Amino acid sequence: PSPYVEFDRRQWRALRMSTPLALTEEELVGLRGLGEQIDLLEVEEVYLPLARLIHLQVAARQRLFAATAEFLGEPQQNPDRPVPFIIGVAGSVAVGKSTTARVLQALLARWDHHPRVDLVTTDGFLYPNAELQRRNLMHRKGFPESYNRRALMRFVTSVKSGSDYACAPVYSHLHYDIIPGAEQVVRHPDILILEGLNVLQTGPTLMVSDLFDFSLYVDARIEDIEQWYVSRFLAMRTTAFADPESHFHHYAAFSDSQAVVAAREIWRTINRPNLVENILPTRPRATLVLRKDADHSINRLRLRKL
Amino acid sequence: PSPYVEFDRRQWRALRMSTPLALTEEELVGLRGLGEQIDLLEVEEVYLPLARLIHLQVAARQRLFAATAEFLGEPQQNPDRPVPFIIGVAGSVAVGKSTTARVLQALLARWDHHPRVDLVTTDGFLYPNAELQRRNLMHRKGFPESYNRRALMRFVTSVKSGSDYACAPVYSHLHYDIIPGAEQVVRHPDILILEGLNVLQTGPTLMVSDLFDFSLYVDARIEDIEQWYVSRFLAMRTTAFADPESHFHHYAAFSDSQAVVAAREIWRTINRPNLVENILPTRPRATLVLRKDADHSINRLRLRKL
Ligand SMILES: C[C@H](NC(=O)c1ccccc1C(F)(F)F)c1nnc(SCc2ccc(F)cc2)n1C
Ligand SMILES: C[C@H](NC(=O)c1ccccc1C(F)(F)F)c1nnc(SCc2ccc(F)cc2)n1C
């Protein structure tokens, strides 16, 4: 007896899921439009129903806003609109958060109830590298204290307050640092998806997850994430590591054997301990847990019972 | 710009609230049965409308359950019924949590959508005095670690899972200890109200508030709670202190002037510090913050924006 409705992938496919409603030409185009070999049979068979489920929560919240506003006789201090519905997305580095978040963004946007869907990563709230050196935290990049938690919280509070303007900084996955002066502006979207390692973490007072209406945790076996983490590092030889500007340049040259060793070391010393200590404990706090197989595909969904 | 809608009592009074909700007399008689010398003005102008706000949220959550169930084609994995809607109620010792909760319980029960409204206090989750001594924690009774947190979490998790049978222990307010072998049985109510000092307290991992659907914080100036505390202390001389085997009997025979001094001192060393350190910081985590005047009447309501 547990707080989850659990489905494996078979069962979830085996449906009897009221109206189907398919993806268009068109919508499938735009979804490879970000398609790092993004599996479209997975988008259609897992992510789309999952997006409908969430849509039911967004729609219910919009109708609550209205039943509540009507009851109070719409006073001058109640907002005219629902404030943004915020969805958190948590999980290890290299688990596919970003893809999950990007797919959901694209799918949720197709409803008339909420076509304006934003996506912000908390990576942009990490302290800049120089700032991090100054605090003796470089070896702790991506641990909770590596983020400007106060700015992170002010941002989400601003969005949840029905502000019309809220700005976050930006983090380069090329330079592995904050890009000075770059900014992402959010403008009272109907939905904000907030993606990051730390979004479901707790603190002593009001924490950002207090401002979430729904959250996901992307899960997998820790040996599988290590493998995806390694592959991603290797593939970086061709891309980000290829620039001589990079602090990781000397890595371009490494053979598959030596790049592995260098990767398995950052995993072991930084990302794995971060996962075990700080990220995985936040997993039972999510509304929905998606567990991925070694081959990247979803094999299990746990949804909090309603 | 802030995450809640604010009404002072004058603004709450300019109150074009849609439904003239029908209060019998009858029900008002029951309502006197919990005399914190309860003001029936208060019930009529404040608690009733609030209970309607809360009702909206239970109703929305109930219908969301059904739309979601129908969307999944009501599979075997899904429960047949919504799980209990859980309301947390926080605030200092002596602030009026218990009364507030007893009143919402009576008001909420009168909708047919949700007639079975349970009330549990987390006081039953304090370690028995015996255990507290064994831990060197007696002078910390009411502080976070004085509770069996694990057991509390297991209790709320069981209720949120849709268990038929969940049990809390009971804490005597006459013997100021856990009552051995005594248990309160909760049987899948439509609404559980969970009341206590620590309900909106934060933990490293899954906290009880993660399982709340709504939460209330009863607030007042720190001086005003002292006064209520002292009076409640004076009033126990005849009742709970009359007990000869009570570890407080030696207070029964205290004159007024002398009992004020003992009370103001115990306030200063256990309950006031607990409020500052552990209870007051949890305040902005509540969905609703009610602030009471010295007269026990609401002068400020703060509701999370929807
Ligand atoms: C400590 C550092 N972490 C980050 O930059 C970071 C911090 C917070 C959130 C996300 C990230 C990361 F950019 F994906 F790595 C890091 N961890 N591994 C690396 S090597 C490049 C790399 C990044 C991500 C990955 F999945 C594989 C390799 N780096 C530079
Ligand atoms: C440390 C002790 N606290 C409790 O028993 C307690 C612990 C957790 C939750 C609630 C309570 C209390 F029973 F309400 F005090 C306490 N603090 N003041 C007292 S004196 C009795 C008393 C209780 C409450 C009150 F408002 C006035 C007097 N006592 C026995």
UniProtKB/Swiss-Prot annotation, chains A, B:
Its main location: cytoplasm. GO terms for cellular component: cytoplasm; plasma membrane. It comes from the Bacteria. Its EC number is 2.7.1.33. ATP binds at residues 91-98. One of its GO terms (molecular function) is pantothenate kinase activity. It catalyses: (R)-pantothenate + ATP = (R)-4'-phosphopantothenate + ADP + H(+). InterPro entries: P-loop_NTPase, PanK, PRK/URK. The keyword Cytoplasm applies. Signal peptide: none annotated. Pathway: Cofactor biosynthesis; coenzyme A biosynthesis; CoA from (R)-pantothenate: step 1/5. Was identified as a high-confidence drug target. Belongs to the prokaryotic pantothenate kinase family. This is Pantothenate kinase. It comes from Mycobacterium tuberculosis (strain ATCC 25618 / H37Rv). The lineage of its organism: Bacteria, Bacillati, Actinomycetota, Actinomycetes, Mycobacteriales. The gene is coaA.
